[PDB]
């Protein structure tokens, strides 16, 4: 039904047109992070707790 | 009654006229075509017909 078919009478016949899309994407920030004392890291069991 | 006559003592008469009559011709504009696709002159059994 829809093949494209001309004529001998050429003219304004099966027109076509074409569509350009587009795709995102983005950034987003993270982290996290934690707290010492000295009093925690001076006298305590372990030497390499850092 | 008409002929110039003049007499011994020819004073200001059989005096004459004279004048000249103009002509015209003008051109006009003509034409005739046809038109032809190219299937009736490539796919036609008389290879000669343009």
């Not at 039904?1 to 099966?14: A, F, I």
């Not at 587009?22 to 069991?45: A, M, N, P, V, W």
């Amino acid at each position: 039904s829809k093949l494209p078919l001309l004529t001998e009478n050429g003219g304004r016949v099966n027109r076509v047109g074409f569509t350009r899309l587009s795709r995102e994407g983005s950034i987003h920030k993270f982290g996290f992070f934690y707290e010492f004392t000295q009093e925690s890291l001076d006298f305590d069991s372990d030497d390499q707790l850092k």
